[PDB]
Design a protein around this ligand. Structure first.
Ligand SMILES: C[n+]1ccc(CN)cc1
Lengths: 39, 156
């Protein structure tokens, strides 16, 4: 039995921590909603 | 139950203790999460019940109490923020420049940030605070890193 609990407001934070790269990938999406890499 | 707009944890008591299985967005009286978080089951909010209204396994999305309401889109140029809600931890904003998933049916923005599975459904926002999609359906690349699609639904 699943339940929900509030965790916060949805707002942009000025000066949030900035990280992560921006990869460009060729991918395939199957009927089950799974993404896979195309090489 | 609580109908206030914002981000919420999705919890279960079925496993050991209280376990966070994902996250979602309450907007305009509708609860939005990824299909793999709830498998389409009903949800509780205090003493109230939230019934599924729309869902799609291939898109990996589900809405409760009404139709999907989120329609903002990544502009393809600007940095966005993941509003990560990890299990047992405070909601935290992470800014990043999305990458791209190129598919036979078009391109989708993607965010290269790695959080525990229970963070699935956390919202990705633009500079106006609009939700441009949900984090948590993606892939594992060559160097072993996780990259999530920015998954967004259609507002009918
Ligand atoms: C494999 N994996 C890792 C993280 C997530 C997250 N929200 C979903 C799936």
């Amino acid at each position: 039995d699943m339940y929900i609990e509030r965790a916060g407001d949805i707002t942009w934070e000025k000066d949030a921590e900035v990280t992560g790269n921006s990869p460009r990938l060729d991918v395939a999406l199957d009927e089950s909603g799974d993404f896979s890499l195309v090489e | 139950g609580e109908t206030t707009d914002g981000v919420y944890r999705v919890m279960t008591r079925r496993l050991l203790g209280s376990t966070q299985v994902g996250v979602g967005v309450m907007q305009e009286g509708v609860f939005h999460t990824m299909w793999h978080v709830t498998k389409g089951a009903a949800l509780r909010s205090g003493e109230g019940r939230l019934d599924p209204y729309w869902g799609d396994v291939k898109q990996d999305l589900v809405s409760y109490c009404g139709p999907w309401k989120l329609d903002a889109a990544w502009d393809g140029l600007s940095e966005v923020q993941l509003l990560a809600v990890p299990p047992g931890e405070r909601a935290k904003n992470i800014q990043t420049l999305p990458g791209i998933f190129k598919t036979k049916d078009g391109d989708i923005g993607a965010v290269a940030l790695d959080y525990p599975a229970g963070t699935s459904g956390s919202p990705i926002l633009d500079k106006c605070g609009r939700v441009i999609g949900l984090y948590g359906n993606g892939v594992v690349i060559k160097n072993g890193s996780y990259v999530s699609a920015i998954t967004q639904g259609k507002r009918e």
